[PDB]
Design a protein around this ligand. Structure first.
Ligand SMILES: Nc1cc(-n2ccnc2)c2cc(F)cc(O)c2n1
Length: 124
């Protein structure tokens, strides 16, 4: 079975919109989304379909760009740093589950370097 996906809304959690968060959706996510290596990260890992039955035995804080995108569209975050942490969790989980040089890891590393370039400068 797959676990329930991470929440994309939470009425207990305060919402906010900042220039930097609009930018993380408008520019950073929506450009990463178009990368040729983006597709494995556009939705939660379906460990049933991919025959990775050990995935959620190892990965306990799963994160993906589909969840991030919905969070950004919902103004789920308080600030840009909260969103950047979700990106880092997504990359870090892929390096934890897989090994250096794996095809998926090369994909994650391409996106990560592009992500780092894009958030080097955020709007004021
Ligand atoms: N062994 C794998 C396979 C993945 N995948 C998913 C679709 N096609 C390959 C995968 C995807 C991720 F977003 C993170 C990972 O850690 C992954 N690990």
């Amino acid at each position: 079975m797959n676990p329930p996906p991470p929440e994309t809304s939470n009425p207990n959690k305060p919402k906010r919109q900042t220039n930097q968060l609009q930018y993380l959706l408008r520019v950073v996510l929506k450009t990463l989304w178009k990368h040729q290596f983006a597709w494995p990260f556009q939705q939660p890992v379906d460990a049933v379909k991919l025959n990775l039955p050990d995935y959620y035995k190892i990965i306990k804080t799963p994160m993906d760009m589909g969840t991030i995108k919905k969070r950004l569209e919902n103004n789920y975050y308080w600030n840009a740093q909260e969103c950047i942490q979700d990106f880092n969790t997504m990359f870090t989980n892929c390096y934890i589950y897989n090994k250096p040089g794996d095809d998926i890891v090369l994909m994650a590393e391409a996106l990560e370097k592009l992500f780092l370039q894009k958030i080097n400068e955020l709007p004021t």
